[PDB]
Curated annotation (Swiss-Prot), chain A:
Belongs to the influenza viruses PA family. The lineage of its organism: Viruses, Riboviria, Orthornavirae, Negarnaviricota, Polyploviricotina. Transmembrane segments: none annotated. It comes from Influenza A virus (strain A/Northern Territory/60/1968 H3N2) (Influenza A virus (strain NT60)). It is an enzyme of class 3 (hydrolase). The gene is PA. Influenza RNA polymerase is composed of three subunits: PB1, PB2 and PA. Interacts (via C-terminus) with PB1 (via N-terminus). This is Polymerase acidic protein. A motif (Nuclear localization signal 2 (NLS2)) lies at residues 180-243.
UniProtKB/Swiss-Prot annotation, chain B:
The keyword Zinc-finger does not apply. InterPro entries: Flu_PB2_2nd (IPR049110), Flu_PB2_6th (IPR049114), Flu_PB2_C (IPR049115), Flu_PB2_CAP-bd (IPR048298), Flu_PB2_middle (IPR049111), Flu_PB2_N (IPR049106), INV_PB2 (IPR001591), PB2_helical (IPR049113). It comes from the Viruses. One of its GO terms (cellular component) is virion component. The gene is PB2. GO terms for biological process: 7-methylguanosine mRNA capping; cap snatching; DNA-templated transcription; symbiont-mediated suppression of host cytoplasmic pattern recognition receptor signaling pathway via inhibition of MAVS activity; symbiont-mediated suppression of host gene expression; symbiont-mediated suppression of host mRNA transcription via inhibition of RNA polymerase II activity; viral RNA genome replication. Gene3D superfamilies: Polymerase Basic Protein 2, C-terminal domain. A motif (Nuclear localization signal) lies at residues 288-291. Influenza RNA polymerase is composed of three subunits: PB1, PB2 and PA. Interacts (via N-terminus) with PB1 (via C-terminus). Interacts with nucleoprotein NP (via N-terminus). Interacts (via N-terminus) with host MAVS (via N-terminus); this interaction inhibits host innate immune response. Pfam families: Flu_PB2_1st, Flu_PB2_2nd, Flu_PB2_3rd, Flu_PB2_4th, Flu_PB2_5th, Flu_PB2_6th, Flu_PB2_7th. This is Polymerase basic protein 2. GO terms for molecular function: RNA binding; RNA-directed RNA polymerase activity.
Length: 712, 308
């Protein structure tokens, strides 16, 4: 590089190399290796003939700090003309003959010319070109190297060891600190004999033929195309092309008025059904009633102790058939679960985990006999009744009124805590105080919500199921559903929800599926909404005593049984649900900051402790209702939880298109004269992202209800 | 003994043999990057699984005669099949164990120890809520050392940490930077780690700059607190508060005896010449200087030889 040469050599050498390049007719930017070669050659030549003098008696001595012969005269510091003149003068006054080319220096002590060479390859090969280039004449040749080598004619180095050592060390140091910065390879691979070449690159072959037909249709050779491109001047091409284009190519704007938008069309058909992993609104718990503070045991024993606290089991019987399968298998599975839970005592050693006996009904439930067999296509080419795959158009379903009820119930408050966060250091800066009060208010408002209970349930269940699947691979293990909380007065409590029986898990990748069957307790009669439960089998198993008010009243107890299998990736997806709180806090803080940016002061006080402010987040036949800040915080948390629990691409598409439409509507409401180019296609996108998911249908209904009020 | 024996059988297989024979030292770093590209199999879950089992940590032999097998409670600390140990052994060492002086720690981690002194000797002002525009320029995150450039900082680091593996430059000049003397005197018997000391010395001695969108202070002390000073729509005001001349003649000669190490050139003689190993494998013949050979105005005096 240029900067390296600038900072390495002294300027006195530098101006001469530039003059030499100008005389030659080269450039310093295009080629740089030749610059370094000339600088090194000039430096070596100047160093080779310095601090040398010869006394009148004929002996040569080295001195530092009167009029004595210099014993050397420089020729390389001069251009061709005066170099030839001085060479002619000296050979005439000494009787010498003109050798051929320009020698480097002349020594009076031996009365003979000297040539100096520096090479990047090794000396032995480089010697021969100089030897056979100049022959049958008296001219010494000395060759150095960048790695300590040296060689001269007749092995008579007419110099002391010290100067040669200095030259060799200078060359070694320049090479050593050149190779460190990353410039030695190109410099070394740049000497093609006695010239310097920057680089080389040619097409020369199959690449040329391939490049030949990679051109516009009116060309045949790459060179002709390059020549045409090089001599290009723009006269009128763009305007001329534009003048002869048809007028149907246009982008016309149609105004967006208050009467323009129309409600979105929803699909029609049979009602939808629940498809969540665990039921949410219709669950109860069997509390363990404050275990000891030192109690930390296996979940199986906790489940057993929770079970022993209930009396009232009866003969179970089916109340709602699954209409696809065998219900006696479900009855036998439940009875086997009860029997194998009770039969623990017939063991000399108490086990840690329970492995279920492989029974016919369990095998049918887990689908261990419905595995298709795989053979090569060659033998089964002649078989009949062969289809591609399950490439069937999805069914269309309408919207029911139970998802709204679930969302309504998910935003209420409970009597437990469900979450306890740890502590941090004390605050000093005022911004730390502001952040602390913000997060303290947010934590206080949403601590006792039901969505936290759902998050904890999902995390515990997914972690336990993943651990069981990774531990045992060829056993039918029993996995309980267990959660923990703190009571109002401050007693830890453990709750049991149901049971899960896992099949066979041999997972090699992250897409393989593992099957299981789930049984859950409930008090909700399925005969009120038969359409909601379509993939469930419901049993009546016992009676429950309620202590509400005076006296004791009995209600039936039901069991919901379902067969499923999720994934290996979705277990990891379910283990991270604590991020919804973070997202809700981010949204609240973003709104606070956005409002505070305009009214340039701190708005954390006008949001929380103010009690005269209300936000419209409700609806009724009367109209639009209002609520407090805690209510909207819980609503956002519930929305995040339900978004986590009902993931689908339809949600992504609907969210994007609805975001665009909402932005257009908001632009309309600000008196900014909006406009569109194609309002329909956005709509047909919105309906084509509206196939089956009840959550997306509820979101579309919410958008329609927002639209009917936003412009009225 | 072990290393030479491991090198011997590596020559038996040819496929590795031309790898060793045809590869220069300068290309070693080219070879070192052909390792692998796939390891991240959910590291958090793997760590959680490994922390559940007993004896998940590896240690050396001598821990067998420094830590008892069982504690007062009666729990095993290490087991026999490097040996396998549990974190209980680490906690026991932190509770009961030998004590050593820690006087060298403030001299090595001083760049970290200045930050706390700057922070806890500071004061705060009010916070302003408004809108602001942030511009960009070159910001210095490491101030470095004055009167020291990037070229000789590496030289100082090599001289202090690896005195026996320097070659060519630093070995032929006749000088000594002052800071090297104090750095060698202070760390006379420091036994923490060569690599850690080298990294910390480079961190506190070498400067480097970057680009940041800062709308406040420009000096280096205002950069490390950028997360506390600026915000989306707020501004917080804050103040910090507070080796002789040698020349090489050629490669190794077989008539001048076995080569010697860098640290054994102290004896030398009054002009003897001998072989020496320098750099990462170079072997050269050296002999000291009978003169000055400096860089004074004499180099410019060559101008008298031209333009008469």
């Amino acid at each position: 590089m240029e900067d390296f040469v600038r900072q390495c050599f002294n300027p006195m050498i530098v101006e001469l190399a530039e003059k030499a390049m100008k005389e030659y007719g080269e450039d310093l930017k295009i080629e740089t290796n030749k610059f370094a070669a000339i600088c090194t050659h000039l430096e070596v030549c100047f160093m080779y003939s310095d601090f040398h003098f010869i006394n009148e008696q004929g002996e040569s001595i080295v001195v530092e700090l009167a009029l004595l012969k210099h014993r050397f005269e420089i020729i390389e510091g001069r251009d061709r003309t005066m170099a030839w003149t001085v060479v002619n003068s000296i050979c005439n006054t000494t009787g010498a003959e003109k050798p051929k080319f320009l020698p480097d220096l002349y020594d009076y002590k031996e009365n003979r010319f000297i040539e100096i060479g520096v090479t990047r390859r090794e000396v032995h090969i480089y010697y021969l070109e100089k030897a056979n280039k100049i022959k049958s004449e008296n001219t010494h040749i000395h060759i150095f190297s960048f790695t300590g080598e040296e060689m001269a004619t007749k092995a008579d180095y007419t110099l002391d060891e010290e100067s040669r050592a200095r030259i060799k060390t200078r060359l070694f140091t320049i090479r050593q600190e050149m190779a460190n910065r990353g410039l030695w390879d190109s410099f070394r691979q740049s000497e093609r004999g006695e010239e310097t070449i920057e680089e080389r690159f040619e097409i020369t072959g199959t690449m040329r033929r391939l490049a030949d037909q990679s051109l516009p249709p009116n060309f045949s050779c790459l060179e002709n195309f390059r020549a045409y491109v090089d001599g290009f001047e723009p006269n009128g091409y763009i305007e001329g092309k534009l003048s002869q284009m048809s007028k149907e190519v246009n982008a016309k704007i149609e105004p967006f008025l208050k009467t323009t938008p129309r409600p979105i069309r929803l699909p029609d058909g049979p009602p939808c059904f629940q498809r969540s992993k665990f039921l949410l609104m219709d669950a109860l718990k069997l509390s363990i009633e404050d275990p000891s503070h030192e109690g930390e045991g296996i979940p199986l024993y906790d489940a057993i102790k929770c079970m022993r606290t209930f009396f009232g089991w009866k003969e179970p019987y089916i109340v709602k058939p699954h209409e696809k399968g065998i219900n006696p298998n479900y009855l036998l599975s439940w009875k086997q679960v009860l029997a194998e839970l009770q039969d623990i005592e017939n063991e000399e050693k108490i086990p840690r985990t329970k492995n279920m006996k492989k029974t016919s009904q369990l095998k049918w439930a887990l689908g261990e006999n419905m595995a298709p067999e795989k053979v090569d296509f060659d033998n089964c080419r002649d078989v009949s009744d062969l289809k591609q795959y399950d490439s069937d158009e999805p069914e269309l379903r309408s919207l029911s009124s139970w998802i709204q009820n679930e969302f309504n119930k998910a935003c209420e408050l409970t009597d437990s805590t469900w979450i306890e966060l740890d502590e941090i250091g004390e605050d000093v800066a005022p911004i730390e105080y502001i952040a602390s009060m913000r997060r303290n208010y947010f934590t206080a408002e949403v601590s006792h919500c039901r969505a936290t209970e759902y998050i904890m349930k999902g995390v515990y269940i997914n972690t336990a199921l993943l651990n069981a699947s990774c531990a045992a691979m060829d056993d039918f293990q029993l996995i309980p559903m267990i959660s923990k909380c703190r009571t109002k007065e401050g007693r830890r409590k453990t709750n049991l929800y149901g049971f899960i029986i896992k099949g066979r898990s041999h997972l090699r990748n992250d897409t393989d599926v593992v099957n299981f069957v789930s049984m859950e307790f409930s008090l909700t009669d399925p005969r009120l909404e038969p359409h909601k439960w379509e993939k469930y089998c419901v049993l009546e198993i016992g009676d429950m005593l309620l202590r509400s008010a005076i006296g004791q009243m009995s209600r039936p107890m039901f069991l919901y049984v379902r067969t499923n299998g999720t994934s290996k990736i979705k277990m990891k997806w379910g283990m991270e649900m604590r991020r919804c709180l973070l997202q809700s806090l981010q949204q609240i803080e973003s709104m606070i900051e956005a409002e505070s940016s305009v009214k340039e002061k701190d708005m954390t006080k006008e949001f929380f402790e103010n009690k005269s402010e209300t936000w419209p987040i409700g609806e009724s036949p009367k109209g639009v209702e209002d609520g407090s800040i805690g209510k909207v915080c819980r609503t956002l948390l519930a929305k995040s939880v339900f978004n986590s629990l009902y993931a689908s691409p339809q949600l992504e598409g609907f969210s994007a298109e609805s975001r665009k439409l909402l932005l257009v509507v908001q632009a309309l409401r600000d008196n900014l004269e909006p406009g569109t180019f194609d309002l329909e296609g956005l709509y047909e996108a919105i309906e084509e992202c509206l196939i089956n998911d009840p959550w997306v249908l509820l979101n579309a209904s919410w958008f329609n209800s927002f639209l009917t009020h936003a412009l009225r | 003994m072990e290393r030479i024996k491991e090198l011997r059988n590596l020559m038996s297989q040819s496929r590795t043999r031309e790898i060793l024979t045809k590869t220069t030292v300068d290309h070693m770093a080219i070879i070192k990057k052909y390792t692998s590209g796939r390891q991240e199999k959910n590291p958090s879950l793997r760590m959680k699984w490994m922390m559940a089992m007993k004896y998940p940590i590896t240690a050396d032999k001598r821990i067998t005669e420094m830590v008892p097998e069982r504690n007062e409670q009666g729990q095993t600390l290490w087991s026999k099949m490097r040996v396998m140990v549990s974190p209980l052994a680490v906690t026991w060492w932190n509770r009961n164990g030998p004590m050593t002086s820690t006087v060298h720690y403030p001299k090595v981690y001083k760049t970290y120890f200045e930050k706390v002194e700057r922070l806890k000797h500071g004061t705060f002002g009010p916070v302003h809520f408004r809108n602001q525009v942030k511009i960009r320029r070159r910001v210095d995150i490491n101030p470095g050392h004055a009167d020291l450039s990037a070229k000789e900082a590496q030289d100082v680091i090599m001289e202090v940490v690896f005195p026996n593996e320097v070659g060519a430059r630093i070995l032929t000049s006749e000088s000594q930077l002052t800071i090297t003397k104090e750095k060698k005197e202070e760390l006379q018997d420091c036994k923490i780690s060569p690599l850690m000391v080298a990294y910390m010395l480079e961190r506190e001695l070498v400067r480097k700059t970057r680009f940041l969108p800062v709308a406040g202070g420009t000096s280096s002390v205002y950069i490390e607190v950028l997360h506390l000073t600026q915000g989306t729509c707020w501004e917080q005001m804050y103040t910090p508060g507070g080796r002789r001349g040698f020349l090489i003649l050629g490669k190794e000669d077989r008539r001048y005896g076995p080569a010697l190490s860098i640290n054994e050139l102290s004896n030398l003689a009054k002009g003897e010449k001998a072989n020496v190993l320098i750099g990462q494998g170079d072997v050269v013949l050296v002999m000291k200087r009978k003169r000055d050979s400096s860089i004074l105005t004499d180099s410019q005096t060559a101008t008298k030889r031209i333009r008469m």
